[PDB]
């Protein structure tokens, strides 16, 4: 069902001298859910219950997001993809995930998850993905209605938009969810970002890292690498397409539809489709895992 209540109990662990928060419920091989910008583990709260008893259900809060510690001192050079990866790699190592992991990914969680999977392919039993960065992109591949705003994020205007005015949390997030969010839902999303200034840096650093038209070169290379790999990998995949969808449409979707050993379903949603179709998404992931774990 829907609902504003989080799933399970938030746990904390020290990673690289910072405390990171995560959900870890049940036993067995992990089903690892990774949020992106500007969300947290909370994104998966109505999806994870569908996988009850099918494995160890894990959802991590990226550094500086959800209940995880802020980097200090924060600034324009902090919260790059590379920095997030250092923390997330270390957290996933610390969690003792084993060698039959099912990844469930979204948004920046997909760049992180696809990259981790490429680097740990022997340990990946299946990949479920939705509204994901399937490859490096060109401006023509980016949703037309958001081009100007994301171009602004990736300019000097970004600090005022995001650090001062919290535009990613307050405008982009509800703007890309079809159903109206409740007071409690928005409260949970805005909580890590209540204070103006550097507390909001992760939500600006992320749009500045999207691999678009060759920049930033490091993230472009990472996405190019996992794009080539996923197009050839026989690891089972679940592609949760969305209607109308948002990011994973056009050429981005044309590409991921070439990936081998892939099941696809379509659900209602724009970008943050977890808020529109959690039961359909959860049911599909559960069925995927059951087939992977007979
Ligand atoms: Ca909306
Ligand atoms: Cl095992
Ligand atoms: Cl972003």
Does 13 belong to an annotated binding site? no
Which residue in 67, 107, 276, 280 is the catalytic one? 107
Decide if 61 is catalytic.
no
**CATH code at position 152:** 3.40.50.1820
Decide if 131 is catalytic.
yes
**Lookup: tokens for 284:** 């599909």
Q: How far, in Å, from the CA of 52 to the mean position of ligand 3?
A: 30
Tokens 């039959």 belong to which residue? Answer: 100
| CA separation for the pair 105, 128 (Å, rounded) | 6
| CA separation for the pair 226, 38 (Å, rounded) | 23
43, 39, 36: which is closest to 108 by C-alpha? Answer: 36
DSSP of 190-205, one letter per residue?
HGGG-SSSGGGHHHHH
Neighbours of 177 (CB within 10 A): 18
Q: Sheet of 10-15: strands edge to edge?
A: 10-15, 18-25, 56-60, 30-34, 101-107, 124-132, 237-244, 262-269
CA dihedral sign, ordered 154, 155, 159, 160: negative
| CA separation for the pair 9, 150 (Å, rounded) | 34
Strand partners, 12: 21
Which residue in 115, 131, 198, 275 is the catalytic one? 131
| CA separation for the pair 45, 256 (Å, rounded) | 26
Give the ligand with the smallest distance to the CA of 125: 2
**Lookup: tokens for 79:** 């919260």
- The total number of structural domains that make up the chain: 1
Tokens 């969808």 belong to which residue? Answer: 245
Resolved by: X-ray
| Structural resolution in Å | 1.8
Domain enclosing residue 166, as ranges: 1-294
Which residue in 84, 271, 275, 280 is the catalytic one? 271
The residues near 175 (Cβ < 8 Å, ≥ 6 apart) are: none
Helix axes 108-119, 81-94, angle to 10 degrees: 60
Q: How far, in Å, from the CA of 287 to the mean position of ligand 1?
A: 29
Decide if 271 is catalytic.
yes
DSSP of the chain, one letter per residue?
---SPPSS-EEEEEETTEEEEEEEESSSSEEEEE--TT--GGGGTTTGGGGTTSSEEEEEPPTTSTTSPPPSS--TTSS-HHHHHHHHHHHHHHTT--S-EEEEEEEHHHHHHHHHHHHTGGGEEEEEEEEE--S-B-GGGS-GGGHHHHHHHTSTTHHIIIIIT-HIIIIIHHHT-SSPPPHHHHHHHHGGG-SSSGGGHHHHHTGGGS-BTTBSHHHHHHHHHHHHHHTT--S-EEEEEEEE-SSSSHHHHHHHTT-SSEEEEEEEESS-GGGT-HHHHHHHHHHHHHHH--
Give the ligand with the smallest distance to the CA of 202: 3
Q: How far, in Å, from the CA of 214 to the mean position of ligand 2?
A: 40
Does 174 belong to an annotated binding site? yes
Q: How far, in Å, from the CA of 42 to the mean position of ligand 1?
A: 18
218, 55, 25, 222: which is closest to 128 by C-alpha? Answer: 55
């Amino acid at each position: 069902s829907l609902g504003a209540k989080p799933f399970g109990e938030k746990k904390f662990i020290e990673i690289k001298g910072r405390r990171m928060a995560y959900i870890d419920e049940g036993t067995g091989d992990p089903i690892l859910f990774q949020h992106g910008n500007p969300t947290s583990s909370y994104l998966w709260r109505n999806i994870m219950p569908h996988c009850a008893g099918l494995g160890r259900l894990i959802a991590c809060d990226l550094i500086g997001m959800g209940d995880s510690d802020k980097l200090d001192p924060s600034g324009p050079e902090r919260y790059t993809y590379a920095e997030h990866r250092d923390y997330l790699d270390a957290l996933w190592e610390a969690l003792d995930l084993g060698d039959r992991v099912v990844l469930v990914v979204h948004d920046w969680g997909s760049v992180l998850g696809f990259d981790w999977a490429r680097r740990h392919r022997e340990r990946v039993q299946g990949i479920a993905y939705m509204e994901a960065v399937t490859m490096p992109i060109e401006w023509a591949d980016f949703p037309e209605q958001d081009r100007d705003l994301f171009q602004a994020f990736r300019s000097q205007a970004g600090e005022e938009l995001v650090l001062q005015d919290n535009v990613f949390v307050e405008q982009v997030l509800p703007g890309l969810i079809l159903r109206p969010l409740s007071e409690a839902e928005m409260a949970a999303y805005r909580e890590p970002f209540l204070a103006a200034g550097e507390a909001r840096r992760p939500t600006l650093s992320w749009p500045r890292q999207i691999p678009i038209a060759g920049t930033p070169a490091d993230v472009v290379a990472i996405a190019r690498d996992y794009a080539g790999w996923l197009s050839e990998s026989p690891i089972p995949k679940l592609f949760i397409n969305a209607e109308p969808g948002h990011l994973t449409t056009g050429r981005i979707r044309d590409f991921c539809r070439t990936w081998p050993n892939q099941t696809e379903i379509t659900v209602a949603g724009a970008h943050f489709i977890q808020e529109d179709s959690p039961d359909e998404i959860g049911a599909a992931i559960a069925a995927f895992v059951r087939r992977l774990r007979p």
